[PDB]
Each structure stands twice: as C-alpha cells, then as structure tokens.
Enzyme design. Structure first.
Site, PDB file in Angstrom:
ATOM      1  N   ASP A  88       0.799  -1.232   0.000  1.00  5.74           N
ATOM      2  CA  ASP A  88       0.000   0.000   0.000  1.00  5.74           C
ATOM      3  C   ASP A  88       0.842   1.297   0.000  1.00  5.74           C
ATOM      4  OD1 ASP A  88      -2.595  -1.185  -0.245  1.00  5.74           O
ATOM      5  OD2 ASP A  88      -2.821  -1.308   1.934  1.00  5.74           O
TER       6      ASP A  88
HETATM    7  O1  LIG Z   1      -0.945  -4.932   8.255  1.00  8.02           O
HETATM    8  P1  LIG Z   1      -1.421  -6.090   7.432  1.00  8.02           P
HETATM    9  O2  LIG Z   1      -2.907  -6.240   7.585  1.00  8.02           O
HETATM   10  O3  LIG Z   1      -0.510  -7.291   7.641  1.00  8.02           O
HETATM   11  O4  LIG Z   1      -1.284  -5.647   5.870  1.00  8.02           O
HETATM   12  C1  LIG Z   1      -1.497  -4.283   5.441  1.00  8.02           C
HETATM   13  O5  LIG Z   1      -0.436  -3.877   4.602  1.00  8.02           O
HETATM   14  C2  LIG Z   1      -0.225  -4.651   3.422  1.00  8.02           C
HETATM   15  C3  LIG Z   1       0.998  -4.061   2.715  1.00  8.02           C
HETATM   16  O6  LIG Z   1       0.854  -2.688   2.313  1.00  8.02           O
HETATM   17  C4  LIG Z   1      -1.524  -4.730   2.587  1.00  8.02           C
HETATM   18  O7  LIG Z   1      -1.334  -5.704   1.569  1.00  8.02           O
HETATM   19  C5  LIG Z   1      -2.782  -5.029   3.441  1.00  8.02           C
HETATM   20  O8  LIG Z   1      -4.007  -4.892   2.698  1.00  8.02           O
HETATM   21  C6  LIG Z   1      -2.815  -4.129   4.679  1.00  8.02           C
HETATM   22  O9  LIG Z   1      -3.813  -4.528   5.612  1.00  8.02           O
END
Ligand SMILES: O=P(O)(O)O[C@H]1O[C@H](CO)[C@@H](O)[C@H](O)[C@H]1O
Length: 1108
Positions: free
Chosen positions: A755
C-alpha cells in the site's frame, strides 16, 4: 436521563484559529484553519499531554513543577485570545501568558520573579498536525508522516515539522522554538520525553535529565525544548512560540517566517483578561502502580510455567499449561509498545457473524476500551485506547482504589495474564493482592469485570467509564436510564435504531459523572460514567451489547472458569484440535507452535469477525484483499468450508456496479460504507479465493448463486443480481482491459499489495507494470480456469489463453539477466525501463522480494529462475529478522514523493517502510514450502515467531510474545540514517523492534503455512493431500489433527534412504493414491477420503515417511 456532551469551556479565537481548553487550562482542541495542531485532547481528570516545567536545581535535589493545566495549581484569567496562568513554585512567583495571535502563531510568555541559584524551563508539546479526522482516526499513523527538521535559530534549537501525508490536499507545517532564552536541547518523540518508565512512575523521565537532542521519528510526535539554566534574583522573562501553516508544499530547508513571528510577537488583545474558576481534584492522588513481584512471589502465584523468557536472569514472561500468557511488570517497562489484548465473543462458525461483541484491554490498567457490538467503529459503548504510554489514562473503563486518604488510579500491575477468553491483572497492595479480571461470556453478548481482594479485605473504589454510545467521545448526547442495579444506555441510529447497551452494577453503588472527582462537585465531563463502590472486598460490572435490541436478562452468576473452558473447546475445534507431541523431548519449534497456534487463531478470528487491532483501532470493514487472505486461508486449512462459502457470497455482493471491480474495503454489516477507489491487485483476490474454495470443496454450485452488486457512490445494493460466474466474467473483462497495447502486461493502476507503493502520478499509474501483479494475475487466471473447467468450457479456454499470454509477457518483458525486475515502466515498445532491477543503475534500489516469492508460489518461475530467486534473496534480501521487501529503502528527500507515494513520505522507519513486513516473509515461507526447502522454511517460521524471539534472533528486541507483529524495523531514528546504514540489517549490527499488533492476515496465513505447507495436511474435493516439508527434527513427532470430522495422529518419519518421496501407512498398510504435481521437487500424495477414513476407523495413527 440525558447525558450532555463535554464542551471545552475556555474558547480562544483569533483570525482563522480556535484554540479550546478544559477549565484547568489543559489543551483540548487547537485548530488553525482546519488543522489540528495538538495530538491528544485533554481530559478532565488527567489534563493534557503538553506542559511547561519549571525545574529547580539544588546541591541535593532536583525539583520540577508543571506551570499550566490542572496539575499545576495555577489560577487562571482569560480574554478572547489570551490566558494568564499565575502561581508560585517554592520561592518563585510565575506568570504564564498564552497568546493566540491572528497569524496562526501562539506564544507562552513566561515571567519568573524570585530568588534561586539554578533553574531551567522545559517546554513540552504533543503535535498532531493533520485534520481533526486524521488525528482522531490514528495518532500514531499521523506521526509516522510528520517529518521534523532541526535548526539553530537566534535562540538555540528550532523544530520545524512538515506533514507529508496530504490533509485535504494540503501539506501542513509547524515551527516551534524559544524567544529571549536559548533552547539548549530538544527531543521530538514522546518515548524520549516521557520514557517507558512513565508507564510505572507516572513521571516524565526527561524531567530528571537533559533532553537527548536527537530527532526520533516514531509514533508520538512530541516536541520538547530545554532552556539554558539560569540564576534568578529579580524578574526574568522569555517565550516559547508555535507557528502553524496549513500548506507548505516544499520540503523544509531553513527556519521560515521570521518577519511574521516578529509581528506576531508584538500582538496583544485589547479586551479585559478576567479571572475564571479553576476546578481542583478532591482526595485524588497520584496513580497506583503495583510493586514488582520477586522470584518467590511469581513461583507461588504461577507454579506451572513453560517457555520462560528471561533477560539477565530476570523473568519477563512465560506461558502456562492452561494456555495463558503471563507478563511480568519489568517486561512492560522494556517494550515500546504496550502489552494488550482483544476479547471477542464466540459465534456460529458456519456463517458470517453479525453483532459480535468485543473489548480491548492493556496491561497498564486500561481494563476495557472500545466495548463494541458488531461494527467496531459505530456500535460502541466505551472510548478507544490511544497512544502508547498511558499519559492520557481516562479512556474506556478505569479503576480508582482508595489507599490512605486518596483515591488512586490503577496503572501497572505486578503481572498481566491473558487467555483467549480474558485478561487478569495482579496488583500487589500492602498485605493483599487485588485481582482484576475482564472476560468474555460464552454464548452471550457480554464482557464482565471482576474485582477481588485475595485476602477478602475491603476497599473503596470508583470505576470510571468514558462513554461514547456512538463512534466518538464527546460527540452525542446519551440516554441513560436506571432500574435497580441495571443501567441502560442508548443514543438520543439510522442503520442500528435499536442500538443499546446495559450494565449490571453492584447493589449499593452510587452513580455520577466526573463531579465526584472535584472539590466543588462541578460536573465538567458529563459522559464520564462513575461508579463509586464503598467498602467491598469484591464486585463485578457486567456489560451487555445489543446492536438489534435483543435484550436478555442477566445471569445470577458470572463465572470466569466456565467461560474459559467453553472458549478453550471452541478454539481447539477451530484449529481441528492441533497438537504436536513426541515420546522424547519435543523440539522447541514444535512447543512454540503448540503455544502460538490458538493465539494466532484468536488474532485471525478477530481480523475476520471484529476487524480491529491494538494500534489499528479504526477498522470495522473487511479489506477486500485481506478477507481473501487471512480469513479464507485460515478457514480453508481447518475445513470451515461452509463459512468460506458464506464469506464469498458476501464478498461478491460487494462488487461495484459499472466499474465491476471491488472496493478497497467495505462494511459487511448494515452500514453502507466502502472505499470505491482500489489498488490494481485487488480484483485478483476474490477470483483466487473463489477458485481455492472450488478446488478445496468441489462446490461449483457457488458459481450459480444469484448475487447483487453495490453502487459506487452510496454503497447501496443495485438490485440487479447476476450469477457469481457473470460477476467473474465482468471482473475478468476489467483485467483484459488493463493490457498495455501489443502485450498482456497488466497495468499497475492504483498499486499492488504494498500500500505504500501507490504511483505518484498518472504516467506511472498507466505505464508501470508490477511483476508481482503480473505473477498474481497469471496464478489467479490459471486457478480460475481449473475451477470453472467443468462448468463453462469456453470461458475456461479463454481464461487459459489469458493466463498463457500473461505468462508470456512475464517471461518476455519482466526478466533480464535471470533477474525478475520489480517493475517495468513502458510508455510504449520504444520507451521502456526496468526499475527495482540491477539495470536501474541510477536508482539505489535493485531487487524486489514480492515477484520472487509469488512466481515460485504460483509455479510460474521455471526451476532455474526459482533457484535464481532464492540466491537473490540470500544475497540481497535475507536478514536475521526475516527477508526484506527490497534491497534498499525507498527514496526520502524531506517528504515529497517522486515515484512512490507513502513509501517516499513516511518519516518513521516502520510498517512497510521497515522493509520487513511479516506478511511478505510468510509468503517467503510458502514459496520455500513449494520448493521443499525444509531447513530454510522452518528457520524462517521461527524468525517471525514472537515466542522467545530474542533467543532465536539475537538483534531482535523483545515484544509481546502471544500476539502477531506486522513488521520488524531497524532502530533507526530517521530515513537518512536508515538509508546510510541499511546494511546493518543484513548483518544484525542494529537492533530491530516489532510493529503493530494483532490485526493482520498474517496470523491466518501463518497458520496455513504451519498446517497446510509444512506439516503438509491439505483438504481437497473428497481427498486429503499429504505433502510435508519438515526437518529431521520433526522425525518421531506426531500431529494430532481432526480430518473430515475424525481425529487422527500423523506421525512423521524423515528417511533420506527411501526409494520414493512419500509413503503413508496405517496399521502398516500403505495408503493408495496419486502423486501431486510439483515442478520444483517430488510431489506429495493425494489419498481418497473414503480410503483415508476407512483406514482411520481401524488405526488412526497414520505414519508419514518422507524424504527431503
Ligand atoms: O498490516 P497487514 O494487515 O498485515 O497488511 C497491510 O499492509 C499490506 C501491505 O501494504 C496490505 O497488503 C494489506 O491490505 C494491509 O492490511
């Protein structure tokens, strides 16, 4: 009864600025234009986080006195834009004048009159610097993007700060410094100012010493400045100032606004500045933290211990045989993040649950925050926990106990014990132990607080509750009725009109707001629900939640043990009775999996059913890619197939009409809210998950379900349902439509999995190609092809052609010199450039993890390429704390983005910017498992296992051991030092620390790695797949596991001398079956269900013989 809202009664106003204060002069909301300058709103019991401290040095002491706020004992005068604080500290008379000028500039003008030998002042300010919405939503996250630049001005240190994440289009800015006196030292994070020790002492640690004069870019944006020391004999005068600008599009290079500051300094209001009444606490002392337990105490209260964590031979934490994790006081004082837990009610595990109840608690005396029923944002009784160090300690449910003359707020216990069903705090008192439990009821929408004196001694208590009854504190009036000892609370709505809560309170308690804390009995905060309980050795408060008003009577008795036992069976069944055993000493890594499995099962279940975390309190919704990973992989691994079917129908009903992609996230309850803008990988996930569902179950009927869409703008049903198959066809058209011309190269669009790597402009959006996305698309469309094969032949053929074309473009365009490039930038066939590849010699970034692992996982990378991938990882990405996302940090040059958005804006080294985002390391494990690399795979599994992590990864700092951590970040104070000394991560020459807790796909996808990919138990359409990737040390170890409703015992044998790869025996009979396909190694075995079960009826000890 109607509860009014708190309104800050001191309201200062001047051109484009409204700065409000509580009546003790504590900051409430400081707003310039539409930017909130402070990070935390003050509360009526603790005051606010900011202050001005007078310190006095003597030959045998140092004293410190807060000059403002309700802890100062200053009297107050106010005007329209001025406050005057007056008081004395020892032999010094002081006045502090606060000025709000028309320039977005404020001053604290300090005048001191007296005699003393040596004194200084410390300026202390928490800063948010975002919209009110952003600050309230997540303070920590806002802090991460607030970049501080330090200069020497006319009067020493000046702190300038740029908010790098856009706030309603703008990049706001702060400047803070001193006038008429030199600031000789500074700090920029709350951890530097308050210290971890605060969590016990309630005293900011910096007040005993010099500020460190280092910019720590962390999560508590907090500016402190220390004056030169001075003698006093007469009157001395000087100021601190702040400047706020709502838009500073450039990076900070120098001290700005010197002329404006000089003009603002000459400003005084014309109006009378007149006395105002200041409330004073009555019989309220400093908080009470328990004394620490010694070794014999711990041994006495916890005779049965496992997995003991020790540092310098002092016990920090351990597990028990009853599946608890216990944290001793000393550990909380060494973890930068506060130990905490989430409770959640059990639900029917065959359907998407609604109205799930949940509550959050923390070791430092936050007994119940964010009590919710269903929606974890809107359907809420108690306010959210905020911050990290409990400076503001009034949120949710808190407890005051009378010790001597004074009510004293409970903070840090001797021990904190977590179980999946509840939390217990142990406070050492004088010749007594006070035991507090907060626990979930089985089958009932309830959380129960129990307080119990171990020696049956009586005490006085006030239990406070910061009510919301709605999403936020201070937002809405509250209807509160009382019948006997039952309170009912409800708002004074559209989608949950029957929303209500009830509390059963002890029988002769008295009820108030904050009035009872004050000398005058003046209410200030009417929404602080206070329960005074006199002379009791024990009591309880039962808290019920009703989202749809299905009110139920209270039980006579509320027994923790029965709940504990019911949840333990629920959790055992949830993981198919997982348990590892051996006749000899079980290996430590197995012991860690037995201890962690139910903790990760709990974390994953929360992520699914009640989406919120510790740091990430703001959730509520399903993330589209998230629900397809964490929950679906967890549930497919454990045979919760009916549940996955329901998830998938709900998911497909959220596809957006017109665009026919998915939102980034959506509420799965009656609230029509979603984020219609999505990243470019998101569409693949519902497609992959439905395919994995179909392969696992044979349930192709799901494709014929008639399912609706949602409208983009309102998130309302369109009332034009189509078959899920047609839903899929429309999604697939969007994918075909993203081909770059002349190719099957899928455009990056809004971004991929990461992200923080959103494209910084339109051209990068259109013309980038993510190699990971490409690989995911190939994998997804192949899985889709197989799943649909028997149902729609022609579509299945087109899907095959698509996957093939995507594969061809992958090999043809995204690989050079055996290295898969992170991205290809393609304006056209003539103008193309690799990024995150060795050829990008202008960049500092030459290798990207994601495509290396996805290509392996999908069996897209041929054996040679897959082997090259692993070498690239070993040489450029592998660290002792796991494998990194890239071989060098993203650019940082003061916060403006060039290629990637948030990756180039984050000031803090953390989250994805850490480059070890644990989710991605788990996919590394999946890839290793596909390749059968059992020693690397098990080693990788342990490197991110929080249990005894510091014994396994020597440069890992300890963190909470019974909860998932989402990243691992080097202890680098800023982006520049991170880039310069990045290589330290590879060799373990910098410490690394844990990121955000609990709320992630990580725990679910970790569980799948354990069960499905390493222990090798996978379920299919009327088949079991057995495909272990285990080390020699799992030889002789048995996995108990429930398969198609039958408990079996899989005993592993690792035999390097076998002729075949795999052999499975029951009562010495070899089970017949077919070898699985695997391009990198010999495959496992597929055994028919009836064969498997038939064998299991006579002898359910299956022996698996496997060769590495
Ligand atoms: O913190 P999580 O839930 O492990 O993961 C989080 O960051 C990731 C990397 O940017 C994304 O792919 C997920 O959608 C977001 O929820």
């Amino acid at each position: 009864g109607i509860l009014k809202t708190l309104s800050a009664p001191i309201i200062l106003e001047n051109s484009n600025s409204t700065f409000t204060f509580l009546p003790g002069g504590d900051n409430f909301e400081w707003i310039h234009e539409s930017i909130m300058i402070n990070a935390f709103q003050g509360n009526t019991l603790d005051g606010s986080t900011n202050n001005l401290y007078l310190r006095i040095y003597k030959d045998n002491s140092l004293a410190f006195y807060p000059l403002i706020g309700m802890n100062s004992k200053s009297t107050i005068k106010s005007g329209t834009s001025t406050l005057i604080f007056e008081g004395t500290a020892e032999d010094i008379s002081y006045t502090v004048t606060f000025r709000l000028t028309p320039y977005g500039i404020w001053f604290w003008d300090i005048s001191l009159s007296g005699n003393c030998n040596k004194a200084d002042i410390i300026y202390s300010q928490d800063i948010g610097v975002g919209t009110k919405g952003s600050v309230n939503s997540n303070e920590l996250y806002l802090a991460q993007y607030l970049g501080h630049s330090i200069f020497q001005g006319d009067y020493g240190y000046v702190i300038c700060s740029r908010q790098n994440m856009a706030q309603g289009d703008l990049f706001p800015y702060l400047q803070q410094g001193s006038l008429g006196i030199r600031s000789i030292a500074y700090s920029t994070d709350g951890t530097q100012f308050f210290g971890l020790s605060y969590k016990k002492t309630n005293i900011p640690e910096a007040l005993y010493g010099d500020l460190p004069s280092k910019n720590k870019q962390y999560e508590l944006a907090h500016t402190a400045l220390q004056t030169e020391a001075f003698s006093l004999s007469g009157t001395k005068q000087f100021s601190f100032y702040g400047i706020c600008k709502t838009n500073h599009p450039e990076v900070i290079r120098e001290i700005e606004y010197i002329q404006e500051l000089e003009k603002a300094y000459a400003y005084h209001e014309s109006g009378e500045i007149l006395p105002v009444n200041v409330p004073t606490l009555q019989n309220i002392g400093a908080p009470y933290a328990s004394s620490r337990w010694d070794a014999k105490q711990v041994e006495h209260y916890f005779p049965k211990r496992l997995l003991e964590e020790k540092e310098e031979e002092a016990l920090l934490s351990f597990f028990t045989p009853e599946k608890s994790h216990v944290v001793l006081q000393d550990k909380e004082l060494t973890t930068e993040r506060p130990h905490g837990h989430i409770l959640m009610t059990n639900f029917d595990v065959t359907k998407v649950p609604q109205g799930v109840v949940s509550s959050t608690n923390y070791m430092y005396g936050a007994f119940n925050c964010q009590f919710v029923v269903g929606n974890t944002t809107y359907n809420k009784l108690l306010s959210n926990h905020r911050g990290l160090l409990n400076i503001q300690k009034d949120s949710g449910q808190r407890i005051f106990i009378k010790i001597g003359d004074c009510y004293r707020q409970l903070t840090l216990p001797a021990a904190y014990e977590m179980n999946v069903a509840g939390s217990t705090w142990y406070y050492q008192l004088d010749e007594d132990v006070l035991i507090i439990t907060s626990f979930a009821m089985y089958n009932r929408p309830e959380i129960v607080l129990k307080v119990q004196s171990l020696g049956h001694k009586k005490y006085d208590f006030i239990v406070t509750h910061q009510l919301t009854v709605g999403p936020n504190e201070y937002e809405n009036e509250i209807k509160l009725t009382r019948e006997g000892n039952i309170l009912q609370l409800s708002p004074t709505n559209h989608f949950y009109p029957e929303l209500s809560f009830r509390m059963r309170i002890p029988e002769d308690c008295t009820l108030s707001d904050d009035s009872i804390f004050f000398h005058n009995n003046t209410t200030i905060n009417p929404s602080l629900l206070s329960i005074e309980i006199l002379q009791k050795s024990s009591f309880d408060i039962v808290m019920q939640g009703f989202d749809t008003g299905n009110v139920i009577p209270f039980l006579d008795q509320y027994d923790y043990k029965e709940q504990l036992e019911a949840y333990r069976i629920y959790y055992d069944q949830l993981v198919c009775n997982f348990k590892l055993s051996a006749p000899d000493k079980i290996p430590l890594s197995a012991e860690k999996l037995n201890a962690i499995i139910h903790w990760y099962a709990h974390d994953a279940l929360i992520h699914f059913a009640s989406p919120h975390g510790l740091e990430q309190s703001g959730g509520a919704a399903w993330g589209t890619r998230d629900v397809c990973q964490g929950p679906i992989e967890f549930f497919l691994t454990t045979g919760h197939f009916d549940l996955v079917r329901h998830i998938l129908i709900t998911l497909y009903s959220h596809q957006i009409e017109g665009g026919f992609e998915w939102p980034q996230w959506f509420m799965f309850d009656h609230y029509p809210i979603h984020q219609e803008d999505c990243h470019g990988d998101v569409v693949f996930w519902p497609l992959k998950a439905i395919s994995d569902y179909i392969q696992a179950t044979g349930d192709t009927s799901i494709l014929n379900e008639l399912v609706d869409y949602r409208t983009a703008k309102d998130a309302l049903p369109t009332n034009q349902p189509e078959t899920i198959l047609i839903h899929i066809k429309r999604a697939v058209t969007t994918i075909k439509n993203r081909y770059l011309s002349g190719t099957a190269l899928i455009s990056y669009a809004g971004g991929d999995w990461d992200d923080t790597l959103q494209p910084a402009n339109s051209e990068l959006k259109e013309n980038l190609v993510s190699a990971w996305t490409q690989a995911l698309a190939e994998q997804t469309l192949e899985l889709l092809c197989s799943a649909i094969k028997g149902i729609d032949h022609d579509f299945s053929k087109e899907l095959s052609h698509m996957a093939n074309d995507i594969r061809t473009s992958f090999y043809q365009y995204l690989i050079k010199d055996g290295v898969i490039a992170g991205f290809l930038y393609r304006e056209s066939e003539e103008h193309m450039k690799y990024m995150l590849h060795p050829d990008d010699t202008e960049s500092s970034i030459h290798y990207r993890l994601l495509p290396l692992t996805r290509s392996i996982i999908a069996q897209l990378a041929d054996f040679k390429l897959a082997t090259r991938n692993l070498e690239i990882i070993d040489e450029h990405l592998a660290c002792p704390d796991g494998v990194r996302l890239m071989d060098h940090p993203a650019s940082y040059s003061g916060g403006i983005s060039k290629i990637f958005l948030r990756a180039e804006q984050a000031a803090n080294v953390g989250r994805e910017i850490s480059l070890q985002y644990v989710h991605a390391h788990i996919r590394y494990i999946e890839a290793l498992a596909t390749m059968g690399l059992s020693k690397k795979a098990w080693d990788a599994l342990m490197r991110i296992n929080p249990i005894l992590l510091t014994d396994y990864v020597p440069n890992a700092l300890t963190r909470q051991s019974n909860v998932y951590f989402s990243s691992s970040e080097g202890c680098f104070d800023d982006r520049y030092e991170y880039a310069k000394n990045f290589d330290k991560l590879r060799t373990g020459d910098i410490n690394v620390k844990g990121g955000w807790r609990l709320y992630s796909s990580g725990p679910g996808i970790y569980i799948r790695r354990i069960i499905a990919d390493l222990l090798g138990i996978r379920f299919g359409h009327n088949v079991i797949h057995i495909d272990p990737v285990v080390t020699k040390e799992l030889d002789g170890v048995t996995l108990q596991f429930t398969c198609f409703g039958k408990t079996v015992f899989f005993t592993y044998h690792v035999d390097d001398t076998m002729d075949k790869h795999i052999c499975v025996k029951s009562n010495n009979n070899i089970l017949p079956g077919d070898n699985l396909n695997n391009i990198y190694r010999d495959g496992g075995i597929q055994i028919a269900k009836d064969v498997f079960l038939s064998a299991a009826m006579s002898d359910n000890n299956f022996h698996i013989y496997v060769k590495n």
